[PDB]
Tab-separated table of C-alpha atoms (C1' of nucleotides) and ligand atoms in Angstrom:
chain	number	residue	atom	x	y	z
C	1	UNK	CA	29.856	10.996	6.781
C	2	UNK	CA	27.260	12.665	4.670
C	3	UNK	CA	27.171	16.407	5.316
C	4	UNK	CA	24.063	18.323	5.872
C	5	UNK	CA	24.059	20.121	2.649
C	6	UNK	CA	24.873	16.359	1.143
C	7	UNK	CA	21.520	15.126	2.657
C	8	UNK	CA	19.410	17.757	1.999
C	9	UNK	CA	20.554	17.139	-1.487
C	10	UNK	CA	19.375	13.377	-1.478
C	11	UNK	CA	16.056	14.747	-0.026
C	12	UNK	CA	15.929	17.417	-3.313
C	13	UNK	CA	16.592	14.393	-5.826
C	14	UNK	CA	14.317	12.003	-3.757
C	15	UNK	CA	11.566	14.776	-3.897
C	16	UNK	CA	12.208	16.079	-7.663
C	17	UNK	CA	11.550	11.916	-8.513
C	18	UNK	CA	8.543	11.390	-6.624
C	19	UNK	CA	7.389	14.518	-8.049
C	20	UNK	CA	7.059	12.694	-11.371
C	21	UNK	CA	5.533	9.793	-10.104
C	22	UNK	CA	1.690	9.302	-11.662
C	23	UNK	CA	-0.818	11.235	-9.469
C	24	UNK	CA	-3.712	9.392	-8.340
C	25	UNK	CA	-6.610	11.522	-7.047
C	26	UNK	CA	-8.109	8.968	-3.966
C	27	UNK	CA	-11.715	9.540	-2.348
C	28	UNK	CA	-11.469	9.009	1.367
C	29	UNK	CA	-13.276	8.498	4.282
C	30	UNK	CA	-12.531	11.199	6.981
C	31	UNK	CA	-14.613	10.219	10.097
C	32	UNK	CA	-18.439	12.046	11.202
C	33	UNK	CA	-19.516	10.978	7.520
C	34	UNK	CA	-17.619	13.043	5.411
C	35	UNK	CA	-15.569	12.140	2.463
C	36	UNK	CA	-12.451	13.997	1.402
C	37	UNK	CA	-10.025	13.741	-1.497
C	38	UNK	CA	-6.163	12.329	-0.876
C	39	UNK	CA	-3.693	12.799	-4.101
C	40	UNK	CA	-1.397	9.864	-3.796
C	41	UNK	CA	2.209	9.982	-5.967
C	42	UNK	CA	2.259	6.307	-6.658
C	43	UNK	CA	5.607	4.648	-7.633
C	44	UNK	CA	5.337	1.985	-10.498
C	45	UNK	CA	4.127	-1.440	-10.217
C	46	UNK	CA	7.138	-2.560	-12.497
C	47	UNK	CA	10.347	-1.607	-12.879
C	48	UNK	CA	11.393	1.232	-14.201
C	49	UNK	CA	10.492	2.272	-10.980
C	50	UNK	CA	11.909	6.208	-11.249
C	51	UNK	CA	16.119	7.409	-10.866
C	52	UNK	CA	17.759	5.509	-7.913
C	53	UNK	CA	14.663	3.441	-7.081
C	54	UNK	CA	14.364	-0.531	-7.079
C	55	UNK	CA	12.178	-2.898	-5.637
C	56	UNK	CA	13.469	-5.191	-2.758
C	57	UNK	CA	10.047	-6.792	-2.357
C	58	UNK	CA	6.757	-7.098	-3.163
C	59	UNK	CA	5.472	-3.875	-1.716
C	60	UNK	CA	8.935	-2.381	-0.298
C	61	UNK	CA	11.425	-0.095	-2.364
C	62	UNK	CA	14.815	1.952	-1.839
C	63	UNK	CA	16.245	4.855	-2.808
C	64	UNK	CA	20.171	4.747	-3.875
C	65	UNK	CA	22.721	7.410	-4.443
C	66	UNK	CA	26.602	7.238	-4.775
C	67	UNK	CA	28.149	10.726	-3.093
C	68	UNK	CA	31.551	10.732	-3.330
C	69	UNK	CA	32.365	7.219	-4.569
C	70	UNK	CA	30.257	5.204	-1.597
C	71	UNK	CA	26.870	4.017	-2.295
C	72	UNK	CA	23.951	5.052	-0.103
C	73	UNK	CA	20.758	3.234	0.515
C	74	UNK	CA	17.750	4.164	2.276
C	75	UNK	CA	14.184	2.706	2.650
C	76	UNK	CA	11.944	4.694	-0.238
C	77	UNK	CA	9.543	6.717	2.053
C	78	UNK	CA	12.453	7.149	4.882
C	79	UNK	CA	14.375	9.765	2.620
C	80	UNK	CA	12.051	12.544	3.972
C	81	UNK	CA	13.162	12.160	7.816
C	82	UNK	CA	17.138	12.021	6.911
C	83	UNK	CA	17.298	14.719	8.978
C	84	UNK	CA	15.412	14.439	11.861
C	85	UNK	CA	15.941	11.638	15.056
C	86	UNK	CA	15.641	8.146	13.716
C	87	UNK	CA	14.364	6.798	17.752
C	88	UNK	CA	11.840	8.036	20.376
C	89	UNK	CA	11.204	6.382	23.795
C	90	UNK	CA	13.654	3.921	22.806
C	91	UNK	CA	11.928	2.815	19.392
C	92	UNK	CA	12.969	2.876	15.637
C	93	UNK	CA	11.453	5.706	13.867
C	94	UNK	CA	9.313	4.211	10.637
C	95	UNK	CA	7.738	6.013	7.836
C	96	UNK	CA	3.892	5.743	8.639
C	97	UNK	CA	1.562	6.035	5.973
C	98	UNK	CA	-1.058	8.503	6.618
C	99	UNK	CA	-2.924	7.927	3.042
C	100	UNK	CA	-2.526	4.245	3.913
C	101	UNK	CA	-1.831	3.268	0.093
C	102	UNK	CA	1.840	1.602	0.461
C	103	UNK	CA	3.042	2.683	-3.122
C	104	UNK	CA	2.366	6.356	-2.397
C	105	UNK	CA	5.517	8.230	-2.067
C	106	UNK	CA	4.576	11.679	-1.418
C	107	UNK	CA	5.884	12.951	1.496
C	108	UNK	CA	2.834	15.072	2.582
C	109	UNK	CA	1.139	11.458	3.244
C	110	UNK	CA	4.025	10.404	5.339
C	111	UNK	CA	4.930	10.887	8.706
C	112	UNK	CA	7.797	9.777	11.161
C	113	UNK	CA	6.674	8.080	14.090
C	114	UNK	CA	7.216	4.536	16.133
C	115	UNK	CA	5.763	1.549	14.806
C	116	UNK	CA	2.956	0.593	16.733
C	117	UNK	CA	1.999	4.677	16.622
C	118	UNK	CA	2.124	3.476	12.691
C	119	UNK	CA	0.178	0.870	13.116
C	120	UNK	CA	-2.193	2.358	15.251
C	121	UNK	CA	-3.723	4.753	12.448
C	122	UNK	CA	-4.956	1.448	10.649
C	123	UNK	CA	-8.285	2.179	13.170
C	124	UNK	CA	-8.252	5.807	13.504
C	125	UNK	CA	-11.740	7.114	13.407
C	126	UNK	CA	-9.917	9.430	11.135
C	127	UNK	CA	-9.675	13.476	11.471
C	128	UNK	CA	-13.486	14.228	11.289
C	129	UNK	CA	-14.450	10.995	13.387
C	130	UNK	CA	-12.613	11.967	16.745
C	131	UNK	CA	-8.650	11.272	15.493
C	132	UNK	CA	-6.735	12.452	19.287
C	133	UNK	CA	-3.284	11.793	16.845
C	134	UNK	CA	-1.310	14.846	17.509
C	135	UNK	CA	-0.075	14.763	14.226
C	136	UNK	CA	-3.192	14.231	12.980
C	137	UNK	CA	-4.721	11.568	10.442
C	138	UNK	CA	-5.634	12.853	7.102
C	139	UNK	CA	-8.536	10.100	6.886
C	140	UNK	CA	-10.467	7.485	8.777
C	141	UNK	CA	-8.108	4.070	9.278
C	142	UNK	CA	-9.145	1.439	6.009
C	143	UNK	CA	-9.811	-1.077	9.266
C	144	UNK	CA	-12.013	1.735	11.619
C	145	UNK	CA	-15.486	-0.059	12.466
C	146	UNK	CA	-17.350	-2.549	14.573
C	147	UNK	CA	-15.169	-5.728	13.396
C	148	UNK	CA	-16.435	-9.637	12.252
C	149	UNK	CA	-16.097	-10.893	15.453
C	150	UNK	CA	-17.030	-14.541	15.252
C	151	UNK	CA	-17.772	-15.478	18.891
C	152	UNK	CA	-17.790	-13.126	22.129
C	153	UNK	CA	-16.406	-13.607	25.448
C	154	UNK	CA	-18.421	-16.924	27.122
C	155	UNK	CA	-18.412	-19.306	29.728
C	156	UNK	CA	-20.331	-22.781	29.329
C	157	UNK	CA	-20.388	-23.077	33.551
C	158	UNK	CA	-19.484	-20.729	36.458
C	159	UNK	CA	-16.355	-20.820	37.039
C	160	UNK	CA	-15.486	-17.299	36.253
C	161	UNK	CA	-16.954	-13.771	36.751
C	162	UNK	CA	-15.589	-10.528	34.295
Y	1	UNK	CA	-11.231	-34.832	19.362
Y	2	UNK	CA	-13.341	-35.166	16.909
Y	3	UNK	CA	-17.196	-35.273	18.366
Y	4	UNK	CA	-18.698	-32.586	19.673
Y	5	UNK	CA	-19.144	-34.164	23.275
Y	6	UNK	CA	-15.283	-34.612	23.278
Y	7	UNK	CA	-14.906	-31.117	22.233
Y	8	UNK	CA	-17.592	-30.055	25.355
Y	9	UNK	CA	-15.226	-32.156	27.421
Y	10	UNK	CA	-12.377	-30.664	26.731
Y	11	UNK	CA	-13.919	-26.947	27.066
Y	12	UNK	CA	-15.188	-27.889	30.085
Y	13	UNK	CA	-11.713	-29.804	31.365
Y	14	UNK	CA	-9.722	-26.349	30.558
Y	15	UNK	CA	-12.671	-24.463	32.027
Y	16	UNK	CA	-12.071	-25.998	35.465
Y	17	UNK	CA	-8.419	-26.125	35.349
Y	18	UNK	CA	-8.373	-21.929	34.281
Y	19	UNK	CA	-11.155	-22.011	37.054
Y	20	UNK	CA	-8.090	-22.483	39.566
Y	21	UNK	CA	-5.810	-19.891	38.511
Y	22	UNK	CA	-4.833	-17.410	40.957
Y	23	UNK	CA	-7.654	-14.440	40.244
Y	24	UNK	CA	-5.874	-11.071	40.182
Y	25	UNK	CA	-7.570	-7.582	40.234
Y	26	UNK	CA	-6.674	-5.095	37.325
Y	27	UNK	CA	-7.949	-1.702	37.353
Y	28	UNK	CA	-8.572	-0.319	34.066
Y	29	UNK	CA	-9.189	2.469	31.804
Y	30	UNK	CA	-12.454	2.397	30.226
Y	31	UNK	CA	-12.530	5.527	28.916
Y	32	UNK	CA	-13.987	9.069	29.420
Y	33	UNK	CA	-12.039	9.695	32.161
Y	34	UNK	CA	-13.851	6.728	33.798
Y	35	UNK	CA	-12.288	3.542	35.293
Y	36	UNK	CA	-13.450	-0.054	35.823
Y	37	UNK	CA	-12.017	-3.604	37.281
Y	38	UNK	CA	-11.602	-6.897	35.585
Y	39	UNK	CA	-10.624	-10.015	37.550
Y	40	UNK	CA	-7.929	-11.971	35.206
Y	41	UNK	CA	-7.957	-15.947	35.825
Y	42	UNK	CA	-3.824	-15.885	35.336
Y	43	UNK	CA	-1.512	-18.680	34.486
Y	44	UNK	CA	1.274	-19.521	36.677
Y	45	UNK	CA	4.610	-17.464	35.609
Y	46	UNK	CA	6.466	-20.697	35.982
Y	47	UNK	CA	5.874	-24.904	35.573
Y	48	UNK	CA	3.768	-26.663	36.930
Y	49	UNK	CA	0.849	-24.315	35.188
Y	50	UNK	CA	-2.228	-26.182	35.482
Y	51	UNK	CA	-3.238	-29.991	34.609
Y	52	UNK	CA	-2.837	-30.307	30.446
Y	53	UNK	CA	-0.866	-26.865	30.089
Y	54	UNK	CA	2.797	-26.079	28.773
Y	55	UNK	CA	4.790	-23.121	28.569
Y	56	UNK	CA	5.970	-22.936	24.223
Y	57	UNK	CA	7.057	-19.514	24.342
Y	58	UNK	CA	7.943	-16.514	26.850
Y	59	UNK	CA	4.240	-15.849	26.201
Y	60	UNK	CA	2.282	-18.610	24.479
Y	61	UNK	CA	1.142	-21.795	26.310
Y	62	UNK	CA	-0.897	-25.159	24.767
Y	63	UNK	CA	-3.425	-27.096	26.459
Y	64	UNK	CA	-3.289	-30.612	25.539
Y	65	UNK	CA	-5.289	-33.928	26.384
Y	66	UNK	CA	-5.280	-37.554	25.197
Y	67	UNK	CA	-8.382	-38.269	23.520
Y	68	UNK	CA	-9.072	-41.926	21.736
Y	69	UNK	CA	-5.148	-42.858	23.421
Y	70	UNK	CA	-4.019	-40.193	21.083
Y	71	UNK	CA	-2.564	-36.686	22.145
Y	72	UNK	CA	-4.867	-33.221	20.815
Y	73	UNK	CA	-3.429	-29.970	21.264
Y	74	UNK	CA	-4.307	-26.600	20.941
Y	75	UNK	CA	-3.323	-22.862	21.682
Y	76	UNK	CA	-4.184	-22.197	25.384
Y	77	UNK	CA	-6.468	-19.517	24.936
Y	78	UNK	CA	-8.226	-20.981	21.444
Y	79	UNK	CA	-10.084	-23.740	23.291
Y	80	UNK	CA	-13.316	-21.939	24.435
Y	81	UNK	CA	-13.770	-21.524	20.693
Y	82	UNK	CA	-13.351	-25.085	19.475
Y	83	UNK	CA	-17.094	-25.150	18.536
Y	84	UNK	CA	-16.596	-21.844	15.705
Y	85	UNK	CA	-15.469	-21.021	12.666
Y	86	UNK	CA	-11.904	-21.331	12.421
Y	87	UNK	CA	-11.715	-18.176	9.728
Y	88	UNK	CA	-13.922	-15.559	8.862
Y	89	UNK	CA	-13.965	-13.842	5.085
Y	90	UNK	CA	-10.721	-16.250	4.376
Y	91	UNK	CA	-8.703	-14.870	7.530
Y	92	UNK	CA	-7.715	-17.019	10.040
Y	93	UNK	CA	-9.852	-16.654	13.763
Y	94	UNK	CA	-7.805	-15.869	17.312
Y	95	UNK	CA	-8.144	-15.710	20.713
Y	96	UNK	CA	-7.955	-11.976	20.921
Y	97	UNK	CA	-7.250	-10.528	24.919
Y	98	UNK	CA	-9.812	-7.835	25.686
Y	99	UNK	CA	-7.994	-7.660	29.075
Y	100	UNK	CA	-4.915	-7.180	27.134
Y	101	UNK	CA	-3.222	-9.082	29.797
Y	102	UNK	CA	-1.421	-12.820	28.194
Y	103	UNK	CA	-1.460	-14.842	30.786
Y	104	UNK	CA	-5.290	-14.154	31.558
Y	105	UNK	CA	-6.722	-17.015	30.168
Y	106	UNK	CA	-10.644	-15.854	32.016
Y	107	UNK	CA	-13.065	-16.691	28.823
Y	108	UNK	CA	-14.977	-13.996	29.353
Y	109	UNK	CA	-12.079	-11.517	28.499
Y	110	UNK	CA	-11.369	-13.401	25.265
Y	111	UNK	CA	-13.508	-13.077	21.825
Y	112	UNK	CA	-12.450	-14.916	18.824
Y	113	UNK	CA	-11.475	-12.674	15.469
Y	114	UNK	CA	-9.353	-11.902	12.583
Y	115	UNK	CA	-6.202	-11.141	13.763
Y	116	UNK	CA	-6.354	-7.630	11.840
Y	117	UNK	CA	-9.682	-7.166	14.692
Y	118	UNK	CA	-7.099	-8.495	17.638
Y	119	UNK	CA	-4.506	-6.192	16.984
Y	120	UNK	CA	-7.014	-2.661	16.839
Y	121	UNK	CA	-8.632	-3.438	19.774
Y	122	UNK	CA	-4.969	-1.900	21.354
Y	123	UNK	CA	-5.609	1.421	20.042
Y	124	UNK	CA	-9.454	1.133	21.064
Y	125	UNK	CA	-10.726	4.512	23.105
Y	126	UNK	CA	-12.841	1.922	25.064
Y	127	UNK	CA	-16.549	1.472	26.206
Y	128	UNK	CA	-16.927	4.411	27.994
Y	129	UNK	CA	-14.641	6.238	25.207
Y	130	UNK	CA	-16.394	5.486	21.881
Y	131	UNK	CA	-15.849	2.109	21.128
Y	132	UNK	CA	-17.701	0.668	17.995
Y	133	UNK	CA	-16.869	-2.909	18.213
Y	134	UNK	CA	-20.131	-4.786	17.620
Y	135	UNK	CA	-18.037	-7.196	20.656
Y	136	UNK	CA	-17.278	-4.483	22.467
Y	137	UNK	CA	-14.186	-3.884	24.673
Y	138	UNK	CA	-13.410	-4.037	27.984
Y	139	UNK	CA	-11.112	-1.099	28.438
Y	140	UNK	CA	-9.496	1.625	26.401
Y	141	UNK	CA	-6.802	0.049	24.475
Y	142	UNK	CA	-3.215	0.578	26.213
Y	143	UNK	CA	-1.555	2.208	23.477
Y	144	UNK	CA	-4.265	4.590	22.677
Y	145	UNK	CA	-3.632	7.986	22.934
Y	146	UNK	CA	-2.412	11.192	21.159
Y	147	UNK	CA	1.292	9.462	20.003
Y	148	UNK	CA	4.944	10.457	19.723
Y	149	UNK	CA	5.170	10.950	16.163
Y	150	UNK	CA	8.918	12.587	15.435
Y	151	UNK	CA	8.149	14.203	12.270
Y	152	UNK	CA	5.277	14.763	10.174
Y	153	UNK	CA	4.375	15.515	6.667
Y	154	UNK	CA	6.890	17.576	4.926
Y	155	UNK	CA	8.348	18.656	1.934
Y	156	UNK	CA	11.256	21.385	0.357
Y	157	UNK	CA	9.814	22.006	-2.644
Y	158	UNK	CA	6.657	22.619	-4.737
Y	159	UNK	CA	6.086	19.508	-6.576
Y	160	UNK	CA	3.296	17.847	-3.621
Y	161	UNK	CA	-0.303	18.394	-2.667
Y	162	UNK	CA	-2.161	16.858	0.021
W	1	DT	C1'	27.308	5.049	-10.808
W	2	DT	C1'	23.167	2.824	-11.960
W	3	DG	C1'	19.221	-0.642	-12.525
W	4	DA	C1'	16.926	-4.767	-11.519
W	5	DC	C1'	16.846	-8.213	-9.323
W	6	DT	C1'	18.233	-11.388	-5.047
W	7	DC	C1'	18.160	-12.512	0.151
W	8	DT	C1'	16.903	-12.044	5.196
W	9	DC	C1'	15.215	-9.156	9.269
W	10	DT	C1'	11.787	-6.340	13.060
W	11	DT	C1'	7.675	-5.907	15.847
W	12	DA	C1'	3.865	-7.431	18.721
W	13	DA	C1'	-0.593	-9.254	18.285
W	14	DG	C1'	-1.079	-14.158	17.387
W	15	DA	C1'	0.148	-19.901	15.973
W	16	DG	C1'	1.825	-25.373	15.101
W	17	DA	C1'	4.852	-29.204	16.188
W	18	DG	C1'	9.053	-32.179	18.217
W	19	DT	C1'	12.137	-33.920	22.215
W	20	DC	C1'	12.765	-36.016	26.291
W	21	DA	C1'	11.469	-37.965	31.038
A	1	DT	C1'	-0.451	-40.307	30.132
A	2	DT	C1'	1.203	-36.168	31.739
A	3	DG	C1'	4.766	-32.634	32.313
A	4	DA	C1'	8.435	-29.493	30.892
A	5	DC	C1'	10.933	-28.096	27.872
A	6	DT	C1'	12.743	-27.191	22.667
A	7	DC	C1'	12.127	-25.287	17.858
A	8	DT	C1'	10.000	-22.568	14.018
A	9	DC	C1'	5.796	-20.172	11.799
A	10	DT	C1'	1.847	-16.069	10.516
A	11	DT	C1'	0.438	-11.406	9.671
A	12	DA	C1'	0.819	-6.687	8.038
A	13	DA	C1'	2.691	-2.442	9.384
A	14	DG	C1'	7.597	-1.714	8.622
A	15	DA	C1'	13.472	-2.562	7.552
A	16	DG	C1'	19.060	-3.558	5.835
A	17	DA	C1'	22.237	-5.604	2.632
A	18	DG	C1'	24.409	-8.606	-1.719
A	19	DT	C1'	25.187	-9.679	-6.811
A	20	DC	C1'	26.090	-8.629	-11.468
A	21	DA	C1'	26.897	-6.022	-15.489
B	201	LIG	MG1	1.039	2.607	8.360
B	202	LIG	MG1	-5.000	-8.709	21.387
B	203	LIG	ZN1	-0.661	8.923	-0.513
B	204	LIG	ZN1	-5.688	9.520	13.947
B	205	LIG	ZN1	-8.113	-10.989	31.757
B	206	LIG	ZN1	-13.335	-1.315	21.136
DNA sequence: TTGACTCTCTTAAGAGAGTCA
DNA sequence: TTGACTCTCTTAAGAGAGTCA
């Protein structure tokens, strides 16, 4: 098995990469009407994607190394969490975007966390709107507001009461 | 069917059968610390469910009728809605739960919405909590709450910036 | 060892359609 | 005509693994 120095390795190459990525300076809605400023490290649209990266789908990548003869493989944003618990409460740990912008790869965007707690931050009133996160959002969720609800809750008769 | 009275038929067909249901009592979390009750109009766990119902999945059931000797059937919980749009902004509309209970099939705890709108509604702080959906909710969203995120952003080196 | 592709799978909110009796 | 089953599919947040040079 990978040792602990071997990881933390991986996680040095994975970050020295990323580092080179473009840098994309984002404006952002944070909640309470304020707008803040998110710097995204966005991997290519098109291969060459960066050392040991390659796309497996449209908006998925992984990160490769070969230690010792034996190829490794990892989901592209997981290499951050190598070394922490990959479960909580009985779920799969998943690399949530807190910037929201898929391609980003920088790890100060990222966090490690089940994936309906991912999920969740899509409508996050975001850290200045009333975010209860504990690690907390870095801006409002892209789908925070009142919805396009098409039709409401309605009866034509009586047959029911809320 | 096709004309609108056999559409009002068939609304008011599955109205009456849901009418029957066995009416349970949930107490619920509205938010700010403050709790409400909805009465759920809840399918049968097992066959027979109700005239023109069937059990396709552990959790999904179809109403059905024959209309013009020919058989029409739909998603149990889409048929108050037969009289809307079937998409909104090029998304497809569904019978979103604001009970957030399946087998309720009361129409006055369902709305009709992008499936994107369906989905946030479980992370909703609720009416009393600061819900902004223009249809608002019933009761905070079960999975709302602070999380149990593992990890969060990180990195070893110098090469990131929020 | 490495790059650039290929394929299918998970989850939990939701769907459509066919086989028998 | 009605009932009770069977199967696979959609979406958008996420995954693992194979092939070839
Ligand atoms: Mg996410
Ligand atoms: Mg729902
Ligand atoms: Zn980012
Ligand atoms: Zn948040
Ligand atoms: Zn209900
Ligand atoms: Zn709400």
């Amino acid at each position: 098995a990978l040792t602990n120095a071997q990881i933390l390795a991986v996680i040095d190459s994975w970050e020295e990469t990323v580092g080179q990525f473009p840098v994309i300076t984002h404006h952002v809605p944070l909640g309470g009407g304020l707008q803040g400023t998110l710097h995204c490290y966005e991997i290519p649209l098109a291969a060459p994607y960066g050392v040991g990266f390659a796309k497996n789908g449209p908006t998925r990548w992984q990160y490769k190394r070969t230690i010792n003869q034996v190829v490794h493989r990892w989901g592209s944003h997981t290499v951050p969490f190598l070394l922490e618990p990959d479960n909580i409460n009985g779920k799969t740990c998943t690399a949530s975007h807190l910037c929201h912008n898929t391609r980003c790869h920088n790890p100060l965007h990222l966090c490690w966390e089940s994936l309906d707690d991912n999920k969740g931050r899509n409508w996050c009133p975001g850290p200045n709107g009333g975010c209860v996160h504990a690690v907390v959002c870095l801006r409002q969720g892209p789908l925070y507001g009142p919805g396009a609800t098409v039709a409401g809750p309605q009866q034509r008769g009586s047959h029911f009461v809320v």
